[PDB]
Amino acid sequence: KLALSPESRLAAAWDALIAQPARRWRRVAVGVNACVDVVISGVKLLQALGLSPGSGKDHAILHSRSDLEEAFLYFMGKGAAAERFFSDKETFHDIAQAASEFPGAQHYVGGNAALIGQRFAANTDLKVLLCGPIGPKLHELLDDNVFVPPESLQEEDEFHLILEYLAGEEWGPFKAPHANRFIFSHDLSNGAMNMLEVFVSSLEEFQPDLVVLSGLHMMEGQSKELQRKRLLEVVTAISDIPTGIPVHLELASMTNRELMSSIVHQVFPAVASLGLNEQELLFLSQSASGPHSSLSSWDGVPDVGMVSDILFWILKEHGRSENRSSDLTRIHFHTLVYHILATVDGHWANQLAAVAAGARVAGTQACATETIDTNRVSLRAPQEFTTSHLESGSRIVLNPDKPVVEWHREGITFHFTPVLVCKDPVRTVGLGDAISAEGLFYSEAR
Structure with a gap:
């Protein structure tokens, strides 16, 4: 034998580490953008x-x-x-x-919710309910195991048209200097969360074990009063779901601070779990004077310590406490080259395998393989890192044979793993949603 690559070593350690939790979800409900x-x-x-x-x-x-x-x-x-x-x-x-x-x-x-639903639906022992603006084409495209209430079925789809051009492409006197895309739509449904009522209404009958919500960011640019009505609908609906049913909020594509502030104040206490990327994380810290608010932009790969300080701060400022009556105990952070799962101690199990599983799907789905093809991936995480920039924390060095790293900090545990990044990806739109769905699938609420 010759020496195996870091990537083959890492993917082998994942395959040994990853296993479903002891107690499994039966039914998950997901809405509402699609x-x-x-x-x-x-x-x-x-x-x-x-x-x-x-x-x-x-x-x-x-x-x-x-x-x-x-x-x-x-x-x-x-x-x-x-x-x-x-x-x-x-x-x-x-x-x-x-x-x-x-x-x-x-x-x-x-759509975040439809993409989440689709990922969950790949497992046949998990039953998925999906609401959102689902016309005949999207229904055809969705996995057969996904149940869409007839209430959530409509005559027309919401088409988003993605018009690509290649570097050097020409049309008459026009020539593209870089490859990029122009997107357009006429999507009022997703903008207004018009299927929120239908989604909320379907939960009681379905009896989800897990509720996953996305689409709030799409209200960006709508009436503040419409936003306020919808956020109150969210919070009311969740207070009617039986106690102990986790709700995950998948937060994406935000640029409005009034709305972000409102989501933090109102919705964060109503959910058990949150999922987001570097962009939304830094945006959160910028709004509410958080650990690295001073930072304007991430300068390359986001610093792990800086990331972890912000996740820590969120669970401290807005997570469950003796006094607070927040339900937020979990944040699945995912960026391009590493993922972190942060949890308030004693509320979740199987979070090593779960973060490993989120990271693995990032590779496989990006490459469009069933398993990790070690020729098409690349380890791009920092070789060493500090677990907190602001506070004094540990100096960690990456070991491909022990890829999932655990560290503790005032009754909150972090679980870090790098990503095996697909070098020649097909299409990586929707990756965060498949990552969050995988992370939740492999999680157990206590």
């Missing part, structure tokens, strides 16, 4: 609509095929990302239909 992502060459679509190349020109809202063409060309010229709302409902239906029917266009389950 859509169909249609990924298509932007130039091809526009050509397919019968459009000749016009001028690049930005438009704040797309009212028309012209506006679409003009803003697309503008961003294609920059090689830059953008996203827009398309205002004409009927015209949008015809464009999305044209994109979805275009030969070679790819169709994907979209």
Whole structure:
């Protein structure tokens, strides 16, 4: 034998460490954001609509095929990302239909909640209920084991059109300097959490063991009063679910501090578990003067200690306490090159295997393999790190044969593992959702 790679050593240690918990969930309910992502060459679509190349020109809202063409060309010229709302409902239906029917266009389950539901549904001994704006195409796309209440089924889907271009791609006088994408939709359902009532209404009959909620971030840019109504609906609904049923909030894509503040004040005490990435974590610390609020942006890989100080602070400021009457005891942090599972001691079991399992799915799903293909992955976590930047904490060195690292801090345990990052990924949109679902699947509430 020759020496195995760090990655093969690590994936072998995971396969030995990972096992389902002693007591397993039977039924999980998930809501409420869901859509169909249609990924298509932007130039091809526009050509397919019968459009000749016009001028690049930005438009704040797309009212028309012209506006679409003009803003697309503008961003294609920059090689830059953008996203827009398309205002004409009927015209949008015809464009999305044209994109979805275009030969070679790819169709994907979209929306945090639907993606979570889909990941859970891969296990046949777990029964999944999913609510959200689910039309005939999304229903077809969803796994057969996923139950959607007839109440949550609708005539039309929410299509999100993802218009890609390659570096060096040309259309008449236009040439993309980088590969990127232009996304547009006409999605009022997900913006308003219009299926929250239907979701809440379905829980009693279903008797979930676990409730998972996502989609709050999508209300960004809606009426503050509409947001306030929905957050109160969330909190009321959760107070009606039987005691001891964990609720996980998957928090993504936030830029509004009023809304973030409100989610922290109102929803955090009502949930057992929280899931998020480096972007939302730092955003939280920026709003409420947290450990590294001073930090404007992560400078490369987020510093583990700095991350852990913020997770610590959240469970201290907003987690369960003798005095507080918060239910929050768990945060599944996931970033590109490592994941951390942080738990208030004595409320959760199997968190070594769970964080390992979250990390493993990040590799396999990114590469679109059933198991880890050790040729297509790469260990990118720091070789050594401090467990707290602000406080004095341990100096840890990565051992591929013992990848899951545990450390304790004032009655809160952290569980760290690196990720085996897919070097040549198919598509990594929705990875955080599959990571959080896997982490919860392998978790046990005490």
